Amino acid sequence: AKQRIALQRWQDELNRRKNHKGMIFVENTVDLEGPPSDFYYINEYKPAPGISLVNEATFGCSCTDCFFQKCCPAEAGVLLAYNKNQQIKIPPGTPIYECNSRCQCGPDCPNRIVQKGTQYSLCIFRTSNGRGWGVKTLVKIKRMSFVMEYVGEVITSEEAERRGQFYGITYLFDLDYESDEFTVDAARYGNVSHFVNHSCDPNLQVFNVFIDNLDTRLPRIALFSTRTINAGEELTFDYQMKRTVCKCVTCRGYL
Amino acid sequence: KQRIALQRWQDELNRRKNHKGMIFVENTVDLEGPPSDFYYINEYKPAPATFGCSCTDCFFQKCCPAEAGVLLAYNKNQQIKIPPGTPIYECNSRCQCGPDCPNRIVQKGTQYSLCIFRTSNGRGWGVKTLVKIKRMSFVMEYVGEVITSEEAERRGQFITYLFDLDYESDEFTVDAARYGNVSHFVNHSCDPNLQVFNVFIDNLDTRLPRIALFSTRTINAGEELTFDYQ
Ligand SMILES: [Zn+2]
Ligand SMILES: [Zn+2]
Ligand SMILES: [Zn+2]
Ligand SMILES: [Zn+2]
Ligand SMILES: [Zn+2]
Ligand SMILES: [Zn+2]
Ligand SMILES: [Zn+2]
Numbered sequence: 308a309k310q311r312i313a314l315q316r317w318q319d320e321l322n323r324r325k326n327h328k329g330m331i332f333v334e335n336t337v338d339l340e341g342p343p344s345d346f347y348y349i350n351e352y353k354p355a356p357g358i359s360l361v362n363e364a365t366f367g368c369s370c371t372d373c374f375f376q377k378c379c380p381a382e383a384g385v386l387l388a389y390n391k392n393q394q395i396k397i398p399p400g401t402p403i404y405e406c407n408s409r410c411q412c413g414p415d416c417p418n419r420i421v422q423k424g425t426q427y428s429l430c431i432f433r434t435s436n437g438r439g440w441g442v443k444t445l446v447k448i449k450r451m452s453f454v455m456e457y458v459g460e461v462i463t464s465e466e467a468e469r470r471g472q473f474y475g476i477t478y479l480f481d482l483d484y485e486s487d488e489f490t491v492d493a494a495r496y497g498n499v500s501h502f503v504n505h506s507c508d509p510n511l512q513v514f515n516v517f518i519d520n521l522d523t524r525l526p527r528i529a530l531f532s533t534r535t536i537n538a539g540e541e542l543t544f545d546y547q548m549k550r551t552v553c554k555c556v557t558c559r560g561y562l
Numbered sequence: 563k564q565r566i567a568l569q570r571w572q573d574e575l576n577r578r579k580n581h582k583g584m585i586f587v588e589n590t591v592d593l594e595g596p597p598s599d600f601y602y603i604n605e606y607k608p609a610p611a612t613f614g615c616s617c618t619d620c621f622f623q624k625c626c627p628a629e630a631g632v633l634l635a636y637n638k639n640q641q642i643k644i645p646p647g648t649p650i651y652e653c654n655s656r657c658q659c660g661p662d663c664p665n666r667i668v669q670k671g672t673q674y675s676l677c678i679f680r681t682s683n684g685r686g687w688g689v690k691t692l693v694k695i696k697r698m699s700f701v702m703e704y705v706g707e708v709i710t711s712e713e714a715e716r717r718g719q720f721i722t723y724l725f726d727l728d729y730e731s732d733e734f735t736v737d738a739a740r741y742g743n744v745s746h747f748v749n750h751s752c753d754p755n756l757q758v759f760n761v762f763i764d765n766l767d768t769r770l771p772r773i774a775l776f777s778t779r780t781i782n783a784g785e786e787l788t789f790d791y792q
Contacts, residue, residue: 322655322763322764323605323655323763326660326661326670327660327661328658328659328660330653330655330656414662423660423662424660424661480743502644528670
């Protein structure tokens with residue numbers, strides 16, 4: 308009775324902080340554990356004192372059809388990320404260059420996906436097998452669809468190397484697309500990806516994203532589906548580092 | 563002594579805030595430093611259902627405001643077009659629109675860089691803008707401890723920080739004596755450049771409106787912000 312009220316109030320606080328379309332629900336049908344005090348919800352990167360994350364894009368495209376025309380990605384020297392059904396078709400490691408505030412195209416541009424924000428309604432739920440909190444979808448997620456960005460406080464590689472000694476299952480994500488200088492820590496600050504569980508068969512994958520940010524030391528990190536994820540299924544990402552035994556039930560075992 | 567204490571306090575306020583614009587603290591006038599018992603807060607602090615629209619174009623279609631029987635508060639340029647006493651029903655977390663929606667202004671947070679400065683005519687602290695503010699545009703919410711009319715009458719016994727949420731109901735009052743945002747420091751003017759609108763976002767209970775402060779005219783960079791409370 309007093310647990311249901313605490314979880315509902317934290318749900319309501321979560322839906323006040325979040326700025327995207329998709330709803331956030333909270334569920335615990337397993338134990339008496341209530342809301343975490345450990346967690347503050349953020350929609351975008353939070354700089355540590357010393358980092359400056361300037362959105363420094365001064366030019367965009369002038370396409371009337373951004374799918375057919377040589378667009379922002381071509382200007383950056385790469386392929387368009389998406390098909391006309393908002394699905395990514397570039398391989399892992401390839402950057403996403405989306406249209407930005409300086410482009411002429413409107414919000415219906417097919418190269419404006421990550422920046423729309425999470426479309427899917429998700430549920431933070433209590434796992435029934437000792438893994439703590441987890442995240443599931445309440446709706447069908449198409450293959451290769453945008454789900455959510457990984458956000459946190461942005462820090463240096465020395466801070467992240469220091470903070471990592473507090474015990475390779477961590478909230479630290481290196482933005483090491485092209486530079487080893489910066490890392491994302493989601494331990495205090497983050498969005499619903501803070502609650503995602505580890506798996507050796509993940510249904511989420513990472514891409515680097517450049518919208519108004521063009522500094523390649525500071526890519527935004529978007530998580531896309533790798534297959535169809537049906538209503539009810541848990542979202543998983545492979546964030547265990549590295550011999551190495553997986554700590555996922557039905558493990559692969561190693562790696 | 564004074565100089566170092568005010569920057570510590572300034573840095574504190576910018577850690578605590580959850581909005582985009584910066585908060586500055588200046589005092590070129592006297593030697594007094596930070597106040598003792600003021601804690602900064604971003605939303606209503608309580609003492610001890612829902613509906614979302616389905617528009618593709620929230621500017622033209624029958625949206626959240628039309629469900630409450632009223633009109634869309636804002637025009638293309640993000641200016642309030644509705645007359646005083648009219649409630650603002652913003653799009654909310656149950657709606658089908660994203661943050662592109664022209665009916666999401668108050669919820670986006672304080673836009674402008676504000677400066678808490680010491681007044682040079684005995685009035686204590688005050689608030690001024692570091693940038694020009696368009697007329698009929700959102701500045702910041704009034705926030706504080708939310709309390710009963712009963713509890714507010716007892717507190718009132720000691721030019722007040724109490725503001726009744728009496729859009730429809732007499733039950734609830736906002737006290738910003740101890741807990742508030744930079745609006746806590748706004749000074750009285752009998753010719754104010756801020757006005758109140760009642761706002762409903764996730765909450766639809768008209769007993770508990772959120773209180774947004776809009777400009778009543780253009781405010782130039784460096785001008786002080788004021789509200790008519792008395
Ligand atoms: Zn284009
Ligand atoms: Zn475009
Ligand atoms: Zn473009
Ligand atoms: Zn495994
Ligand atoms: Zn609408
Ligand atoms: Zn809307
Ligand atoms: Zn709406």
